[PDB]
């Protein structure tokens, strides 16, 4: 009834490769395509809701998750690993930031904390790395809008636009041709839907696509009135109807 | 291959080979049985007389838990003792908190979860015993049998060890021939017979019979050993049936 | 506080006043001191309101987990869990709890757990500051195997007197009836019980 | 039990080498090259970003050059995530020293502390070492301008000019050829960029691929200024030195 | 073969090889005999020397005034187990003013040995013990194996060539059990039993070790010229 | 321990510390040196609870000597005083605090300046031209306020110190058995053997 | 401090005065004693002000995480249970006395909680040094089936009784209304009946009145380039 | 090849121990089914008592976790009971801490997170079970949430688990393709149980007696299991139309 | 015996039009004994100013603590901390020593670099925030300062008028306190310049 794995399960091979990290990246490659695009007045993150059965209710499975009111996350790879990372990311935003500074962390620092948790699963005793790559989109007052990718190694990079998982190589080429520094949010959503159609085989609609934005403040979603400085969350998950509306102008 | 070298490793079948190897140690042990009767339970066990130098009636194998539960087992005897020691701790803490003595199904799960926990890690070995146990609680008589995997079910009759097939067949006859049920005193006699019949699998060495029972009418719902005239009556009945 | 539990032919009835005081100020005049730890096991609370609430919540947790595993607990079992908490934490608790419940096998049972954490199974029990004034009345008027209406009258009259003499007690007389039929709440207002 | 699966990260080979340290160094040899050059009036840190994509947001990106305090900076070669764990420890150590003594931490003391942490992972704990090599560029009032390097073994050494990561053999020869002791910061900037331009595995050296920094005692009124170069400023210094 | 690297691993036939290898250490050890009547219980032990300059390794250890054992196998493991028995005998006396039953002493040794066979990192005990005692139900003799199995007997022997002594006791059973109120004759039977396990060497004055416990006899060990009487 | 004085002049720091050690009824010693050399150009005098004073001083001495060997370098008086303050500030919220008051007189070889630091048992640090602990300041500060100049020589500092000690010997009820005087300057630490 | 809670038809209202005091001295004349735990769960706080802010923010933080974990809007009974178990553990040393009110999918709720961990249920509650003055008003004018407008009126009248009659309370009335199926409306300084009158004199000094020894520029900027 | 013995990645990015735990799932050779009514959630499971010496009342793979939540398990009984005891403890702790009954979907998530840990941490093996949680949730209504050894979970309109799960799944898929609703449009739970049993008979192609089935029913504020005589009444009604 | 009045001293902060002011006396004592006339009680971390009264060892300890924390903040955030954020950091830090507190009365003052808004705040020894529009007072003559500020203060004073108001508030409060005085300092803070002025006052 002992934990006897106090030694690293990820180690350097003779060629300098960290095998378990590479194999985690291979698991991410098999995962469903997800992408992120940054506009001047917002960020969009999107993915396919690959339903494991038609009897399953794919609304109950959230691939796109709110981390803070101004930060959202999407993934490619192993879903269960993502779910526990979201739980830890939400909690670390409070314990190592909000309970100290009385405000939510900026995107880059929350990303840094997630990256740290993933790095530790790459060096600590008796654990394998997380088999996910995350795309974290967010806004904060001093940095503005931003989009970050986080890999199983714990490495993170800021992107203007990117894609991860199944059809990422093709999707990144598509985003290079379309992306410019003068995009509005609606233009980025349009490009996101165009890019994502290429990697989807079957049905392509609001029920099979999950899409969220980091944009303007939503005082209608705040839940209370009376404090002028609190203007509401910038994270908003688009509805099934809102996606289908934009697919007609596609 | 290599899946059978470490406990808690799933083979490509979905099996835990180390648990299946513990079963082999159980199959190698002496025969033990349990019979559920009208208002209680009867336990019996085969004790192989390795030598004349063994003191008769002294090396007692059946163990009591609390005052109302009997436990008998086949396989590695020390593993069985370790399991009963745990059972006694579980029964003590239950009674400490809840006042009432531990119910038999509750007690069965306490042993079950503990045995199951020894299939979860490579740092421990599975239990090398199948345990037949039971007694009388507020809801009546209960007989259980618990395997190395942590699996257990309730039984009408139970048997384990080297002579288990022989015993099981004899128990199945009693179930068919007595649907209304069996009395406590009948079950003691039948238990003696079944151990004697099951001794054909261990026929090289002679043996010593040991019986215990809990019965609401015969023992006030307490576990007691069958001794003296009642034990000899059961031996005589058993000896008459084999001839 | 004036609280009592009384066994009768069909089961058991718990009774209580509704007053909670901080010094001479009545912090709550409509307090509910009859609290449920299981469907048919309730208790009357006296002493530190923080302590008796904390204890009762833990007991309700223990009996819920008991029920998931072993089916419905006895009233004796519930009293034992209360006792374990009260006895082992006697140095840091001020709690005087009466446990009352209905089995079909055992029928109505009452257990009182005073400050020390001892247990005492009784036909009826009285407790709280106002109970001192009705030891005489309750001993003279209690009978075993009373009807429901007689037992309600016995509790009503008893707590009426406890309320009359004890400043710490007052407000409404709440009662909870535990029988095979189910769980019935009763309430009795000042204009009713004062004129008795 | 568990013994079966243990790689045993902290053992000697028959030749007296630490397997995991040697393999971590092999990992580091594939990382983008980082160069440090120390002059009389300052220190230059130049480093090559590894991944080139047009879509990478360069102005907000940091994989190579990190600030430890106002006087000390590091250039990283190896696993970026491993480096950030160590960097945060060094940042805390610097502030602990400042709290205790009310003076900025001397460069060597910080370097020794980090190097000791790396050493620990090679001698006990059964964990893999950190796959990181640092170049430390710093200033204090005792020794003035200092360059150091540390590697996964926990060994550190002092340098006038040094490279880590890819093509260090080639890079160290080129530096050894053109370095002189009386050299100045503006000359050292030019040497660092010329060296990277020759050793790079890429077809050409451009601004979007580089991180660049200078520590100068050429702040207003005898103070020391760290300057992490912006993308546009790296583009300007590439045109000035005549590489693009 | 593949399943003997540690105690935590069952073989495909349900065997624990590390326990069986510990059992083998006992067979290599020097012979010791145990036997009892209704009044007394006796240990007789053939001690082993390293060479002619060396002392003879002590085989018998006292656990209490009414109990003690003889060892065969790893002597440091007997020291660990006898120290544990001393403490349990002592705990019984101090807390309950009660002499520890010999049967209960066997149960404690069984359970201590068992824990070492089921967990990783540990090893089984590499020693076999013969415990004699006189308690409230008379004389007792136990045989402890480091598998955990403890067995109450009239007589037995463990160690190298122990089968010869064990056969003799099996024949003599009806005679030596009746040797009541005569400690010298019971020891004689034990000395005659251990003689069946000798080859080449014979029982000398610093070779032989005898212990006895009984009705009005505390556990006492006899070595040196004290055992010359029985040679 | 009773009286410890400090005065920073032009080119040195002078520490004067009483020689008496009293244990209740009797004066057990009249030649006690209430000081430790922390480094070649840093001296610390101390006064407070019995046992704690010396234990603390020697603990500080060991740590500064350890630092000196590790870095092959003498810490500045400011750095030493900050280290000492933190240890006392750590001490005050402990299970059993060090009841020790100190003066740290040092010559900063980098800045070529004498420096005097006053730190009480709570960890209250102040840099001063002259300082004291306990009741010593009550008698002496009026004289120091009057006569002190920042450009005084070492000999003038000693004469002003004699006046302070004379006032202490006149008006204090306790016999502190005179003072040991030590000077800290660019050449190190030396004791004035006749005072 | 005077704080109240009043149930009504389709929700609950809480209110508070705005005076924070150290002994007999008024530290803040416009203090906010109404705290958000979640968007639709607010509480009014009395007792040690650091303790009330700390316990609200801790439970509020854990409530938010719980809401995200369960994909459900937070319940008042959860805020109550977490507050009481925390306060009980600290045996009254965390001096927080709170009136906890809110709306959730279960309905509208009103509780009080004391520093030792006892909780209470009611249609109208008061806490703080002005609680007796407030409760007098509540006991005189409360009825069943109050409208929103009647509950706001009653609540602010109860706070006024505290403001005027209790020395520990003063200045303004803050109100928060939590109605079922609507956003909670926080009404900061709902009443302002204690504006200071214009002073008789201006105390603005002539420039150069104060004697100065030294002037210097303080460098707030970082170390500069070049 | 020790990447197949513990839960670390193979070169393909696979966890073989997780995959083999899924195979242990079908070791009992028992098929389960869960469907939703208007006011209820029904779960049915095959019951096989091969030995005549067994007490058939003690043979069960349906568990009463809390009053509101029921759980059926597909997998060996020791791992089933391990999961059952834990789910009971987690449901009780939740009620104590947060003051309301643990929702079905939240329990499923919690047990899924625990299962995820066994796929990441080496010393703990996965449990070889699929857990199907059922309730009538006070916010979401009739609910089916299923957990597996990978740590995956999701909500279901209806679901099936076991060796012959695909046959049952396609049968259910086809019914909901006709009706075009997310549930069985039926008022009484009795008729929803009759639907569940009927559609299992059609999918598996086998007839059932009262002792061959085991039924669990979730209603508002209680989950309960049907007796052999309650099932017999269900089987009589099916045969009579 | 009372830790908050062993050493003595005061801090006052005020807001004006596009500016804030913070000011403190210079005394450190051991009860009746005056020890230092140069013990400054105002510190700054970038453009955020922190005054601290109370026990002097804790004043020094907290300054060293917030320097530590704001340095690490700046390295990670890549920007200087703002007054609003720092105020929450001070509160968090004090409350984490709830049952063994620092015996201090901190006062935050500064201008938000992005919004340009003047900001002041005060705290009790365990971290309760008083965010006043007008003024914040702290120390052994806090009552005296409350009296001065309440009558002398008017809103939207220009920087050079605000200097006179805060100076006269501090000086006359300190002269009615035995444990305060021995010199004084006044910081006038604008968005991108800060002037520091030492005041001449009675030295008793
Ligand atoms: Cl979880
Ligand atoms: Mg009254
Ligand atoms: Mg695992
Ligand atoms: Mg004064
Ligand atoms: Mg004066």
Summarize the structure.
This is part of a larger assembly, with nine protein chains of nine kinds. In chain F, 33% of the residues lie in helices and 33% in strands. Chain F has 195 residues and is α+β, with helices and mostly antiparallel strands.
Folded structure, characterized:
The structure is cut from a larger assembly and holds nine protein chains of nine kinds. Chain A has a single domain, classed as Glutamine Phosphoribosylpyrophosphate, subunit 1, domain 1 (4-Layer Sandwich), CATH 3.60.20. In chain A, a hairpin with a 3-residue loop joins β5 and β6 (144-150). In chain A, α2 (79-101) crosses α3. Chain A has helices spanning 19-30, 79-101, 107-120, 168-178, 185-199, 240-248, and strands spanning 34-38, 43-48, 65-68, 71-77, 132-140, 144-150, 156-158, 161-164, 209-214, 224-225, 235-237. Chain A is an alpha+beta fold. Chain B has a single domain (1-243), classed as Aminohydrolase, N-terminal nucleophile (Ntn) domain (Glutamine Phosphoribosylpyrophosphate, subunit 1, domain 1, 4-Layer Sandwich), CATH 3.60.20.10. Chain B is 38% helix and 25% strand. The radius of gyration of chain B is 18 Å and the shape is globular. With 196 residues, chain C is of the alpha+beta class. In chain C, the strands form three sheets. Chain C has a five-stranded antiparallel beta sheet. A five-stranded antiparallel beta sheet of chain C has the order 5-6-7-8-9, covered by helices on one side. A two-stranded antiparallel sheet of chain C has the order 3-4. The radius of gyration of chain C is 16 Å and the shape is globular. Chain H is built from six helices and ten strands, in the order αββββααββββααββα. In chain H, the strands form two sheets. Chain H has a five-stranded antiparallel beta sheet. A five-stranded antiparallel beta sheet of chain H has the order 3-4-5-6-7, covered by helices on one side. β10 (224-225) of chain A pairs parallel with β12 (184-191) of chain G, so a sheet runs across the interface. Bound molecules: chloride ion and magnesium ion (4 copies). One magnesium ion is lined by residues 174-175, 177-178, 180-181 of chain I. Chain D: Belongs to the peptidase T1A family. Chain D: One of its GO terms (biological process) is proteasome core complex assembly. Chain D: It is found in: Cytoplasm; Nucleus.
């Amino acid at each position: 009834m002992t934990d006897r794995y106090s030694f690293s399960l990820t180690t350097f091979s003779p060629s300098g490769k960290l095998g378990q990290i590479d194999y985690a990246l291979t698991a991410v490659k098999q995962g469903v395509t997800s992408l992120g695009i940054k506009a001047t007045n917002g960020v969009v993150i999107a993915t396919e809701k690959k339903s494991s059965s038609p009897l399953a209710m794919s609304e109950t499975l959230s691939k796109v998750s709110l981390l803070t009111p101004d930060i959202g996350a999407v993934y490619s790879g192993m879903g269960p690993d993502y779910r526990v990372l979201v739980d830890k990311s939400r909690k670390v935003a409070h314990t190592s930031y909000k309970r100290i500074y009385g405000e939510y962390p900026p995107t880059k620092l929350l990303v840094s904390e997630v990256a740290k948790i993933m790095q530790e699963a790459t060096q600590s005793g008796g654990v394998r790395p997380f088999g996910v790559s995350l795309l974290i989109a967010g806004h904060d007052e001093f940095n503005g809008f931003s989009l970050y990718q986080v890999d199983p190694s714990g490495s993170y990079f800021p992107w203007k636009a990117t894609a991860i998982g199944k059809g990422s190589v093709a999707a990144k080429t598509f985003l290079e041709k379309r992306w410019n520094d003068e995009l509005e949010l609606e233009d980025a959503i349009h490009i996101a839907l165009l890019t994502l159609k290429e990697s989807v085989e079957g049905e392509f609609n609001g029920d099979t696509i999950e899409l969220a934005i980091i944009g303007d403040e939503n005082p209608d979603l705040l839940g209370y009135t009376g404090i002028p400085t609190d203007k509401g969350p910038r994270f908003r998950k688009l509805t099934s109807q809102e996606i289908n509306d934009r697919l007609e102008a596609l | 291959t290599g899946y059978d070298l470490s406990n808690s490793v799933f083979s490509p079948d979905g099996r835990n080979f180390q648990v299946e190897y513990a079963v082999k140690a159980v199959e190698n042990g002496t025969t033990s049985i349990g019979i559920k009767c009208n208002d209680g339970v009867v336990f019996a066990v085969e004790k192989l007389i390795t030598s004349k130098l063994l003191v008769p009636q002294k090396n007692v194998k059946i163990q009591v838990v609390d005052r109302h539960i009997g436990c008998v087992y086949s396989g590695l005897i020390p593993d069985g003792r370790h399991l009963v020691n745990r059972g006694r701790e579980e029964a003590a803490s239950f009674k400490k908190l809840y006042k009432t003595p531990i119910p038999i199904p509750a007690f069965a799960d306490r042993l079950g979860q503990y045995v199951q926990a020894h299939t979860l890690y490579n740092s421990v070995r599975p239990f090398g015993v199948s345990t037949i146990f039971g007694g009388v609680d507020k809801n009546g008589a209960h007989l259980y049998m618990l395997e190395p995997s942590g699996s257990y079910w309730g039984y009408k009759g139970a048997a384990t060890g080297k002579g288990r097939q022989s015993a099981k067949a004899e128990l199945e006859k009693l179930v068919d021939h007595h649907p209304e049920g069996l009395s406590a005193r009948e079950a003691v006699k039948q238990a003696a017979k079944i151990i004697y019949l099951a001794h054909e699998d261990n026929k090289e060495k002679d043996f010593e019979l040991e019986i215990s029972w809990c019965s609401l009418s015969e023992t006030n719902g307490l576990h007691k050993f069958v001794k003296g005239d009642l034990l000899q009556e059961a031996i005589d009945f058993a000896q008459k049936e084999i001839n | 506080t004036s609280i009592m539990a009384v066994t009768f032919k069909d089961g058991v009835i718990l009774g209580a006043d509704s007053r909670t005081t901080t010094g001479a100020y009545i912090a709550n005049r409509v307090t509910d001191k009859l609290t449920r730890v299981h469907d048919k096991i309730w208790c009357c609370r006296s002493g530190s309101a923080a302590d008796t609430q904390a204890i009762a919540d833990i007991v309700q947790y223990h009996l819920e987990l008991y029920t998931s595993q072993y089916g419905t607990p006895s009233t004796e079992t519930a009293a034992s869990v209360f006792k374990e908490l009260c006895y082992e934490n006697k140095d840091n608790l001020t709690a005087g709890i009466i446990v009352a419940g209905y089995d079909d096998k055992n029928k109505g049972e009452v257990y009182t757990i005073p400050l020390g954490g001892s247990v005492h199974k009784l036909p009826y029990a009285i407790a709280g500051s106002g109970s001192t004034f009705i030891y005489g009345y309750c001993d003279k008027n209690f009978r075993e195997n009373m009807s429901k209406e007689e037992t309600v009258d016995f509790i009503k009259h008893s707590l009426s007197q406890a309320i009359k003499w004890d400043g710490s007690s007052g407000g409404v007389i709440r009662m909870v009836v535990l029988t095979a039929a189910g769980v019935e709440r009763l309430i009795f207002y000042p204009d009713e019980y004062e004129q008795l | 039990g568990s013994r079966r699966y243990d790689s045993r990260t902290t053992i000697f080979s028959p030749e007296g080498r630490l397997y995991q340290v040697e393999y971590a160094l092999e990992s580091i040899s594939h990382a983008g090259t980082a160069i440090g050059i120390m002059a009389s009036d300052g220190i230059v840190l130049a480093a090559e970003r590894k991944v080139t994509s047009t879509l990478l947001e360069q102005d907000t990106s940091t994989e190579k050059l990190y600030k430890l305090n106002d006087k000390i900076a590091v250039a990283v070669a190896g696993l970026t995530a491993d480096a950030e764990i160590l960097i945060n420890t060094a940042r805390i150590h610097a502030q602990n020293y400042l709290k205790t003594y009310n003076e900025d931490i001397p460069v060597e003391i910080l370097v020794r502390r980090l190097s000791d942490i790396k050493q620990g992972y090679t001698q006990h704990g059964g964990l893999r070492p950190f796959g990181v090599s640092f170049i430390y560029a710093g200033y204090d009032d005792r020794y003035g301008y200092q360059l150091y390097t540390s590697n996964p073994s926990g060994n550190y050494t002092g340098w006038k000019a040094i490279s880590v990561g890819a093509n260090t053999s080639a890079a160290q020869t080129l530096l050894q050829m053109d370095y002189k002791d009386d050299m100045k910061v503006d000359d050292a900037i030019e040497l660092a960029l010329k060296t990277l331009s020759k050793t790079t595995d890429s077809s050409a050296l451009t601004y979007d691929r580089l991180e660049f920094a200078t520590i100068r005692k050429g702040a207003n009124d005898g103070e020391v200024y760290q300057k992490i170069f912006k993308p546009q400023e790296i583009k300007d210094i590439l045109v000035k030195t005549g590489i693009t | 073969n593949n399943y003997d690297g540690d105690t935590v691993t069952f073989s495909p036939t349900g065997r624990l090889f590390q326990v069986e290898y510990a059992l083998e250490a006992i067979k290599q050890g020097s012979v010791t005999v145990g036997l009892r009547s209704n009044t007394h219980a006796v240990l007789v032990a053939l001690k082993r020397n390293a060479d002619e300059l060396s002392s003879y390794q002590k085989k018998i250890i006292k656990c209490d005034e009414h109990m003690g054992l003889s060892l065969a196998g790893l002597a440091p493991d007997a020291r660990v187990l006898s120290n544990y028995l001393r403490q349990q005998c002592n705990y019984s006396s101090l807390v309950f003013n009660r002499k520890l039953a010999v049967e209960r002493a066997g149960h404690l040794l069984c359970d201590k040995a068992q824990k070492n066979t089921q967990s990783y990192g540990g090893r089984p005990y590499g020693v076999g013990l013969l415990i004699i005692g006189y308690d409230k139900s008379g004389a007792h003799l136990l045989e402890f194996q480091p598998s955990g199995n403890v067995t109450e007997l009239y007589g037995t022997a463990i160690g190298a060539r122990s089968q010869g002594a064990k056969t003799y006791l099996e024949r003599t059973l009806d005679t030596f059990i009746k040797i009541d109120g005569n400690p010298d004759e019971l020891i004689k039977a034990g000395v005659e039993a251990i003689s069946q396990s000798l080859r080449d060497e014979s029982l000398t004055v610093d070779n032989l070790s005898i212990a006895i416990v009984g009705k009005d006899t505390p556990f006492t060990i006899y070595d040196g010229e004290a055992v010359a009487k029985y040679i | 321990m009773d009286i410890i004085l400090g005065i920073r002049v032009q080119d040195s720091v002078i520490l004067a510390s009483s020689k008496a050690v009293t244990r209740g009824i009797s004066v057990l010693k009249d030649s006690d040196d209430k000081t430790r050399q922390l480094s070649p150009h840093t001296l610390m005098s101390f006064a407070g609870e019995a046992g704690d004073t010396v234990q603390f001083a020697e603990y500080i001495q060991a740590n500064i000597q350890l630092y000196s060997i590790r870095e092959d370098y003498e810490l500045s008086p400011q750095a030493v005083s900050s280290f000492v303050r933190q240890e006392l500030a750590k001490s005050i919220r402990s299970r059993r605090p060090y009841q020790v008051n100190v003066l740290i007189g040092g010559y900063d070889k980098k800045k070529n300046k004498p420096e005097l630091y006053q730190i009480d048992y709570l960890g209250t640090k102040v840099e001063l031209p002259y300082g004291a602990h306990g009741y010593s300041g009550f008698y002496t500060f009026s004289l120091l306020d009057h006569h002190y100049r920042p450009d005084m020589t070492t000999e003038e500092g000693l004469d002003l110190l004699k006046l302070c000690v004379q006032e202490l010997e006149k008006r204090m009820p306790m016999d502190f058995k005179g003072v040991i005087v030590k000077i800290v300057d660019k050449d190190g630490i030396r004791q004035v053997d006749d005072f | 401090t005077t704080i109240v809670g009043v149930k009504f038809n389709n929700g609950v209202v809480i209110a508070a005065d705005t005076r924070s005091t150290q002994g007999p001295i008024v530290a803040d004349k416009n203090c906010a004693k109404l705290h958000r735990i979640s968007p639709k769960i607010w509480c009014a706080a009395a007792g040690t002000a650091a303790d009330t802010e700390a316990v609200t923010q801790l439970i509020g933080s854990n409530i938010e995480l719980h809401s995200l974990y369960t994909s459900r809007e937070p319940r008042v009974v959860s805020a109550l249970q977490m507050l009481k178990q925390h306060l009980f553990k600290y045996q009254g040393h965390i001096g927080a006395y709170l009136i906890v009110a809110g709306v959730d999918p279960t309905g509208s709720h009103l509780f009080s909680i004391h520093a030792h961990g006892s909780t209470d249920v009611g249609y109208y509650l008061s806490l703080g040094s002005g609680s007796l003055a407030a409760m007098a008003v509540l006991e005189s004018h409360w009825k069943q089936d109050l409208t929103k407008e009647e509950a706001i009126k009653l609540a602010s009248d109860a706070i006024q009784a505290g403001i005027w009659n209790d020395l520990g309370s003063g200045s303004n009335v803050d109100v928060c209304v939590m109605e079922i199926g609507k956003d909670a409306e926080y009404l900061r300084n709902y009443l302002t009946p204690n504006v200071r009158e214009e002073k008789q004199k201006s105390y603005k000094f002539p420039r150069g009145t104060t004697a100065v020894l030294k002037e210097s520029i303080v460098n707030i900027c970082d170390i500069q380039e070049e | 090849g020790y990447d197949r013995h513990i839960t670390i990645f193979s070169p393909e990015g696979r966890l073989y121990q997780v995959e083999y735990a899924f195979k242990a799932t079908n070791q009992t050779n028992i098929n389960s089914l869960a469907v939703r009514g208007k006011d209820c959630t029904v779960v049915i499971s095959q019951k096989k008592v091969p030995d005549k010496l067994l007490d058939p009342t003690t043979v069960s793979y349906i568990f009463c976790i809390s009053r509101t939540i029921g759980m059926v398990v597909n997998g060996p009984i020791p791992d089933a009971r391990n999961a059952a005891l834990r789910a009971k403890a987690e449901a009780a702790e939740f009620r104590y801490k947060y003051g309301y009954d643990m929702p079905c979907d939240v329990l499923a998530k919690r047990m899924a997170n625990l299962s995820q840990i066994y796929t990441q941490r080496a010393y703990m093996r996965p449990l070889g079970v699929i857990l199907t949680f059922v309730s009538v949730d006070e916010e979401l209504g009739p609910s089916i949430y299923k957990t597996d050894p990978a740590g995956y979970y999701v909500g279901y309109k209806a679901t099936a688990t076991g060796p012959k799960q695909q046959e049952i799944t396609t049968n259910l898929e086809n019914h909901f393709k006709k009706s075009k609703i997310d549930h069985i449009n039926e008022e009484s739970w009795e008729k929803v149980v009759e639907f569940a049993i009927t559609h299992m008979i059609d999918a598996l192609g086998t007839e059932f007696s009262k002792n061959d089935l085991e039924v669990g029913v979730a209603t508002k504020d209680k989950f309960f299991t049907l007796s052999a005589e309650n099932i017999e009444e269900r089987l009589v009604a099916i045969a009579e139309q | 015996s009372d830790p908050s009045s062993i050493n003595g001293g005061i801090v006052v902060a005020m807001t004006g039009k596009d500016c804030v002011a913070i000011a403190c006396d210079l005394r450190l004592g051991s009860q009746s004994l005056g020890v230092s006339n140069k013990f400054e009680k105002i510190f700054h971390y970038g453009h955020v100013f922190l005054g601290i009264t109370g026990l002097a060892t804790d004043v020094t300890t907290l300054n060293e603590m917030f320097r530590y924390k704001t340095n690490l903040y700046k390295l990670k955030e890549e920007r200087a901390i703002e007054p609003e954020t720092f105020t929450q950091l001070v509160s968090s830090s004090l409350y984490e020593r709830r049952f063994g507190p620092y015996f201090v009365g901190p006062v935050v003052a500064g201008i938000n670099s992005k919004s340009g808004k003047p900001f002041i705040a005060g705290f009790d020894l365990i971290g309760c925030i008083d965010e006043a529009k007008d003024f914040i007072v702290s120390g052994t003559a806090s009552d005296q300062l409350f009296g001065m500020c309440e009558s002398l203060y008017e809103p939207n004073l220009e920087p050079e008028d605000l200097f006179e108001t805060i100076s006269q508030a501090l000086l006359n409060a300190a002269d009615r306190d035995a444990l305060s005085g021995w010199g004084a300092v006044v910081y006038i803070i604008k968005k991108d310049e800060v002037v520091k002025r030492y005041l001449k006052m009675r030295q008793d």
